[PDB]
Amino acid sequence: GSLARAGKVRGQTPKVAKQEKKKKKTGRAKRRMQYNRRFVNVVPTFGKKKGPNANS
Amino acid sequence: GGKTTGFGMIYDSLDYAKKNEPKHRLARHGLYEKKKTSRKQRKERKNRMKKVRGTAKANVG
Amino acid sequence: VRMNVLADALKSINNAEKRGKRQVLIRPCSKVIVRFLTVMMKHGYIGEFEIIDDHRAGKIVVNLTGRLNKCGVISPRFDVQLKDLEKWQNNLLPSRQFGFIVLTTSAGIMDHEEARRKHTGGKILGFFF
Amino acid sequence: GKCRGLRTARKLRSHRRDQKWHDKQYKKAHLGTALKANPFGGASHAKGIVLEKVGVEAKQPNSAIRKCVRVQLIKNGKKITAFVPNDGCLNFIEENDEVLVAGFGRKGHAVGDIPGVRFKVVKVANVSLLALYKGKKERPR
Amino acid sequence: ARGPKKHLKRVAAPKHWMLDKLTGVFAPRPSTGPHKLRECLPLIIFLRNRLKYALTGDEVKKICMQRFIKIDGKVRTDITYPAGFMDVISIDKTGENFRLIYDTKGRFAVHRITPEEAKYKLCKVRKIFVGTKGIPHLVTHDARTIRYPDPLIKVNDTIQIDLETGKITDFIKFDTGNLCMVTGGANLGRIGVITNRERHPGSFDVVHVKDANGNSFATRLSNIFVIGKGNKPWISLPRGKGIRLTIAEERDKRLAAKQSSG
Amino acid sequence: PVARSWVCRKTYVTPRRPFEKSRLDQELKLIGEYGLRNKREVWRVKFTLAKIRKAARELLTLDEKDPRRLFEGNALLRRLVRIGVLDEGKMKLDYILGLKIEDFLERRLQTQVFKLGLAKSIHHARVLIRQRHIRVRKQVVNIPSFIVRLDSQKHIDFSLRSPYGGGRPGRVKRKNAKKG
RNA sequence: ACGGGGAAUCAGGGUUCGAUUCCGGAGAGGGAGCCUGAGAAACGGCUACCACAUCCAAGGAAGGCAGCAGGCGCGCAAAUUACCCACUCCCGACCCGGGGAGGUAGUGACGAAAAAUAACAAUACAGGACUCUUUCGAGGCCCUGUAAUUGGAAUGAGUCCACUUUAAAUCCUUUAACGAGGAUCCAUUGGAGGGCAAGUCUGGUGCCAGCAGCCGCGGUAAUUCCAGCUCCAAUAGCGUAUAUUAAAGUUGCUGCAGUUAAAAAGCUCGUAGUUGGAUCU
Incomplete structure (x- = not known):
């Protein structure tokens, strides 16, 4: 078929700049943060399905 | 940083020290000076002398 | 034709035990069959048996205490060294707590534990648990 | 049934040797026709010159124009069709330029929609396609 | 090469x-x-x-x-x-x-x-042969050649050589009951009394040796070096008297020595 | 030919199943509880315990009076007792199979520095060890994974040169005192 | 296809690899033939031919990096034309000389080990803590975090000095000086439908562009493409291609199958092969 459309969608999408955000911790501190999130303090545990990236 | 471990020799005289010590350990004391030429210069001079015969070998370099 | 009369004997005992019967007829009998039966009986797996003496070859009636889960033969009779006995008894036995591997040995026909006690190997005849 | 005899080692070994040839993977590996027929000649990657850009129609359940290139391998001169993975990445490749090509991931087998294509372009002009796609590097003029 | x-x-x-x-x-x-x-x-x-x-x-x-x-x-x-x-x-x-x-x-x-003791050394005679118009010759493991040895000295015996002059001053025969060290093989360095020599014509003779602690081992005849007549060595022996402790006894001895300090 | 040695060895093993929720949770719990940098520290301690268990198992297949079984089981049990992982009462090879990974994790220098009151948390313990504040006997130890032996446990102090253990205030305190 | 010691993987059994530093062999562009010597059919010896090739005043002369660097070529694919005989050893007439053997540095994300990228406190907040069978009158002797909040402490990355190191150096170690609050001294590589950890959130595209190892996604609410935010997997590492091992009891000795899924010869005889009944204190 025709090769005219090659960077069609990638070129035609509106370019949105990455937002500025503070750096994430690394190494033992990042794992400490993960451990605290998963295990130490967890309120919404009442027998329902919750995911770490739930948008609802 | 507590401590440093090394090795040491104490010779009976300075003459025995000059006789038995490695030349670099004598040079560290100022009692020896090595050749100022390099290995490269000596090797190329030797291979050049190889091309001449007789007393002309001393007349090289 | 029939080779390994011990194989036939052990398979007949196995099938009779599965059928729940209290006695099994084994023919022909042989020295190896009798020694294997004695090994099985010293551990309480079969109970007393009787040798019907024909004038050609033996017959045996084995009383069957319902304890035999499985008696089997290994063909061919692989030669087994003491260092290789654990692998055989790990492949053939259901547990390390019970079950025996029978070996023919220069010291006689006997189970693997007693073969270890006599510090000797041999040829694997079969197993029972 | 199989032979169970103390002296059947020759029969068992010969039977295994013969019946291993009826295994597709073993015969392909040990026969030599596959290595002769392999364009890379057993290599993981290969360099070629982009002869042209082609568009391959995806197989019937799907509808797309997969952008590939016909390249000719430097090592042996064979003509290969190599997929150009991401989008707009065909704009980075220009005809008659050097390209480093790898397998498509299925050991000489077509992948997904693209029929008869078992190679993908990894580098073009000695700079990776991933660096060009993300803007890390640019085409050398 | x-x-x-x-x-x-x-x-x-x-x-x-x-x-x-x-x-x-x-x-x-x-x-x-x-x-x-x-x-x-x-x-x-x-x-x-x-x-x-x-x-x-x-x-x-x-x-x-x-x-x-x-x-x-x-x-x-x-x-x-x-x-x-x-x-x-x-x-x-x-x-x-x-x-x-x-x-x-x-x-x-x-x-x-x-x-x-540094005046002499033991030498195991490697061969005896006659040469040079009837002169008997003896060759040791040390590779020194000695002319006119004692007529009783045979192969595998041990002679004592005075290092100053290098001539035989004494000899032990290879007999059962004589002390010997092992100079090769698995039992290398072990000292014990020769118990019996099993002869294999055309092959290697095996010598059985019993330690001073009662441990019995065996070596090839080529690995046996007679040390003393009877069970008394003719040389000084190291701190270990040729008795090879098993690893368990070595561990026990090391632990006992360590626990005796401090 | 070189005068170099190429004896090198990998100290861990990657799990067979990469994304397994139960194993991920267990490893993260160990990491957070013991202040570990990554999953490789868990896998390293797991590999150590696995090799110890394999040796103990292979010894348990030998005869109870086997010279090698006696010697090497005694050595292995002595080694496990020496680092505090095994108790002196349980000097049988069967008790090796009952050991857990946490048993070895308690004996790290980080865990002991936290548990002896020298640090406020396990992460404070790690940064204290990494900053040359901790010594065992007279040796300034800098490795968090240093496995403390039973007789080295009572000699974990606070370093004679650290600001916490003998003087010479640090860069920050000296700079601030100079400022005012 | 150099062989082996060995390597990878591996429940048991196996499968694959081993040009590669140790041992043995072979070769020095291809063959062949020798001289000397204890030892060579030697190539950093010679003679010739074959291929290639250097200088030439055209008469002649001189070649052999599969030694150490380095260059070209080949390719997916691999480092300095460095320093030294100080070490290990070797050779010699030799305690003294020589050694691109060897050692030392340079390049090095082959690979392996250790291991930073923050820790703590207060403040506001949240959570539990038989908190009274509901509202900060028994809720700070515990714990968490967007906290660009507030504080002091602690550090080595780095720069630099003197030692130390070493033939001489470097590096590490050791002092000392400066060195952290977006501690901007900034962690990445892949992914987020399932397999398989992680969003049917927002915008764009509209069977296009693309994704997708496989099943599949995309034709106007795309959880799958292109992006933003968020999340999660490993982490100074992660992705891809290829070969290989396990998974593969899909080569089955352990341990597979053959009625219909692939499969028992049309049927007998029959040699080798394989396997062969009881019995002898």
């Missing part, structure tokens, strides 16, 4: 030299001499690795070229000279004599001997 080899890789060196692996690529190739390459201790290993009298091979050469080292009563300046079993090393400057004697682990111990 063409002609003889002149190097020895450090890892192909005999393990009883206890050479490490990171010092260099090469081990000191023993010179040709009285003892075999794998059954000897070169002078450099003795003076540097065992005695720590030198730190490098240059210092070993410096010691040897001052003619301070005697081997079997003769000054040797070859730092790779092969010193082997029963050989006496005399350093008169420091006034110390050693006899190269195997450990129970198969290693040449640093065994110091008295200057009176």
Whole structure:
């Protein structure tokens, strides 16, 4: 078929700049943060399905 | 940083020290000076002398 | 034709035990069959048996205490060294707590534990648990 | 049934040797026709010159124009069709330029929609396609 | 290869030299001499690795070229000279004599001997033959040839050589009941009384030996070196008397020695 | 030919199943509880315990009076007792199979520095060890994974040169005192 | 296809690899033939031919990096024309000389080990803590975090000095000086439908562009493409291609199958092969 459309969608999408955000911790501190999130303090545990990236 | 471990020799005289010590350990004391030429210069001079015969070998370099 | 009369004997005992019967007829009998039966009986797996003496070859009636889960033969009779006995008894036995591997040995026909006690190997005849 | 005899080692070994040839993977590996027929000649990657850009129609359940290139391998001169993975990445490749090509991931087998294509372009002009796609590097003029 | 080899890789060196692996690529190739390459201790290993009298091979050469080292009563300046079993090393400057004697682990111990013992050495006669118009000749493991030996001395016996003159002064026959060391094999360095010799014509005779603690082992006849008549050695023995402790007894002895300190 | 040695060894093993929720949770719990940098520290301690268990198992297949079984089991049990993982009462090879990974994790220098009151938390313990504040006997130890032996446990102090253990205030305190 | 010691993987059994530093062999562009010597059919010896090739005043002369660097070529694919005989050893007439053997540095994300990228406190907040069978009157002797909040402490990355190291150096170690609050001294590589950890959130595209190892996604609410935010997997590492091992009891000795899924010869005889009944204190 025709090769005219090659960077069609990638070129035609509106370019949105990455937002500025503070750096994430690394190494033992990042794992400490993960451990605290998963295990130490967890309120919404009442027998329902919750995911770490739930948008609802 | 507590401590440093090394090795040491104490010779009976300075003459025995000059006789038995490695030349670099004598040079560290100022009692020896090595050749100022390099290995490269000596090797190329030797291979050049190889091309001449007789007393002309001393007349090289 | 029939080779390994011990194989036939052990398979007949196995099938009779599965059928729940209290006695099994084994023919022909042989020295190896009798020694294997004695090994099985010293551990309480079969109970007393009787040798019907024909004038050609033996017959045996084995009383069957319902304890035999499985008696089997290994063909061919692989030669087994003491260092290789654990692998055989790990492949053939259901547990390390019970079950025996029978070996023919220069010291006689006997189970693997007693073969270890006599510090000797041999040829694997079969197993029972 | 199989032979169970103390002296059947020759029969068992010969039977295994013969019946291993009826295994597709073993015969392909040990026969030599596959290595002769392999364009890379057993290599993981290969360099070629982009002869042209082609568009391959995806197989019937799907509808797309997969952008590939016909390249000719430097090592042996064979003509290969190599997929150009991401989008707009065909704009980075220009005809008659050097390209480093790898397998498509299925050991000489077509992948997904693209029929008869078992190679993908990894580098073009000695700079990776991933660096060009993300803007890390640019085409050398 | 063409002609003889002149190097020895450090890892192909005999393990009883206890050479490490990171010092260099090469081990000191023993010179040709009285003892075999794998059954000897070169002078450099003795003076540097065992005695720590030198730190490098240059210092070993410096010691040897001052003619301070005697081997079997003769000054040797070859730092790779092969010193082997029963050989006496005399350093008169420091006034110390050693006899190269195997450990129970198969290693040449640093065994110091008295200057009176350093006057002689035991030698296992390797062969007896007649040559030179009826003159009997004797060849030992040390490779020294002795003319006119005692007519009773046979192969596998042990003679005593006075190093000053190098002639036989005594001999032990190879008999059952005589003390012997093992100079090769798995039982290398073990000392015990010969129990019986099983003969295999056309093959290797096996000699059975019983330790002083009652442990019985066996070796080939070529590995047996008669040490003393009866159970009394004619040489000094190392701290371990040829009794090879098992690893359990070695562990127990080490633990007892450690717990006795502090 | 070189005078170099190429004896090198990998100290861990990657799990067979990369994304397994139960294993991920267990490993994260260990990491957070013991202040570990990553999953490789868990896998390293797991590999150590696995090799110990394999040796103990292979010894348990030998005869009870086997010289090698006696010698090497005694050595292995002595080694496990020496680092405090095993108790002196349980000197049987069967008790090796009952050991857990946490048993070895308690014996790290980080865990002991936290548990002896030298640090406020396990992460404070790690940064204290990494900053040359901790010594065992007279040796300033800098490795968090240093496995403390039973007789080295009572000699974990606070370093004679650290600001917390003998003087010479640090860069920050000296700079601030100079400022005012 | 150099062989072996060995390597990878591996429940048991196995499968694959081993040009590669140790041992043995072979070769020095291809063959062949020798001289000397104890030892060579030697190539950093010679003689010739074959291929290639250097200088030439055209008469002649001189070649052999599969040694160490380095260059070209080949390719997916691999480092300095460095320093030294100080170490390990070797050779010599030799304690002294020589060694691109070897050692030392340079390049090095082959690979392996250790291991930073923050820790703590207060403040506001949240959570539990038999908190009274509901509202900060018994809720700070515990714990968490967007906290660009507030504080002091602690550090080595780095720069630099003196030692130390070493032939001489470097590096590490050791002092000392400066060195952290977006501690901007900034962690990445892949992914987020399932397999398989992680969003049917927002915008764009509209069977296009593309994704997708496989099943599939995309035709106007795309959880799958292109992006933003968020999340999660490993982490100074992660992705891809290829070969290989396990998974593969899909080569089955352990341990597979053959009625219909692939499969028992049309049927007998029959040699080798394989396997062969009881019995002898």
